């Protein structure tokens, strides 16, 4: 990409989560969304402490938004797919 420059409007749940890490917008690019999702993962400590490239999001809003209990941070296309479903593209 840039496919990452894609303009997007997050749906209410996703928008609430981004604003909780200080996102101050209703419309974003795909790369801004990932930045703030990465920062949410950090503050909630959902990344594997054993450093095995996995986010454990079960029993957390992210888990509910992504429809999985855990994901690899290396599956970039998978992550964008899970993100797009919580978004209206502009
Ligand atoms: C340690 C941890 C889990 C907080 N962060 C990452 O592994 C980030 C990462 C970023 C970042 O802002 O780069 N944003 C993310 C959003 C989600 Cl949901 C999960 C992980 C990341 N990443 C590499 O550095 C992996 C990665 C980068 C781009 C794409 Cl399209 C997909 C994965
Ligand atoms: K929603
Ligand atoms: K705008």
UniProtKB/Swiss-Prot annotation:
Region (Necessary for interaction with USP2): 1-90
Induction of its expression: By DNA damage.
Coiled-coil zones: none
Ranges that cross the membrane: none
Tissue expression per record: Ubiquitous. Isoform Mdm2-A, isoform Mdm2-B, isoform Mdm2-C, isoform Mdm2-D, isoform Mdm2-E, isoform Mdm2-F and isoform Mdm2-G are observed in a range of cancers but absent in normal tissues.
Posttranslational modification: Phosphorylated at multiple sites near the RING domain by ATM upon DNA damage; this promotes its ubiquitination and degradation, preventing p53/TP53 degradation. Autoubiquitination leads to proteasomal degradation; resulting in p53/TP53 activation it may be regulated by SFN. Also ubiquitinated by TRIM13. ATM-phosphorylated MDM2 is ubiquitinated by the SCF(FBXO31) complex in response to genotoxic stress, promoting its degradation and p53/TP53-mediated DNA damage response. Deubiquitinated by USP2 leads to its accumulation and increases deubiquitination and degradation of p53/TP53. Deubiquitinated by USP7 leading to its stabilization.
Family: Belongs to the MDM2/MDM4 family.
Misc. remarks from the entry: MDM2 RING finger mutations that failed to ubiquitinate p53 in vitro did not target p53 for degradation when expressed in cells.
Subunit structure and binding partners: Interacts with p53/TP53, TP73/p73, RBL5 and RP11. Binds specifically to RNA. Can interact with RB1, E1A-associated protein EP300 and the E2F1 transcription factor. Forms a ternary complex with p53/TP53 and WWOX. Interacts with CDKN2AIP, RFWD3, USP7, PYHIN1, and RBBP6. Interacts with ARRB1 and ARRB2. Interacts with PSMA3. Found in a trimeric complex with MDM2, MDM4 and USP2. Interacts with USP2 (via N-terminus and C-terminus). Interacts with MDM4. Part of a complex with MDM2, DAXX, RASSF1 and USP7. Part of a complex with DAXX, MDM2 and USP7. Interacts directly with DAXX and USP7.
Function text: E3 ubiquitin-protein ligase that mediates ubiquitination of p53/TP53, leading to its degradation by the proteasome. Inhibits p53/TP53- and p73/TP73-mediated cell cycle arrest and apoptosis by binding its transcriptional activation domain. Also acts as a ubiquitin ligase E3 toward itself and ARRB1. Permits the nuclear export of p53/TP53. Promotes proteasome-dependent ubiquitin-independent degradation of retinoblastoma RB1 protein. Inhibits DAXX-mediated apoptosis by inducing its ubiquitination and degradation. Component of the TRIM28/KAP1-MDM2-p53/TP53 complex involved in stabilizing p53/TP53.
Disease implicated: Seems to be amplified in certain tumors (including soft tissue sarcomas, osteosarcomas and gliomas). A higher frequency of splice variants lacking p53 binding domain sequences was found in late-stage and high-grade ovarian and bladder carcinomas. Four of the splice variants show loss of p53 binding.
Protein name as it appears in the record: E3 ubiquitin-protein ligase Mdm2
Organism name: Homo sapiens (Human)
Name of encoding gene: MDM2
């Amino acid at each position: 990409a840039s496919e990452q420059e894609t303009l997007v409007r997050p749906k209410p749940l996703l928008l609430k989560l981004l604003k909780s890490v200080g996102a101050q917008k209703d419309t974003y690019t795909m790369k801004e969304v990932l930045f703030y999702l990465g920062q949410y993962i950090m503050t909630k400590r959902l990344y594997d402490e054993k450093q095995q490239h996995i986010v454990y999001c079960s029993n957390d809003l992210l888990g509910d938004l992504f429809g999985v209990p855990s994901f690899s941070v290396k599956e970039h296309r998978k992550i964008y797919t899970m993100i797009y479903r919580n978004l209206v593209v502009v």
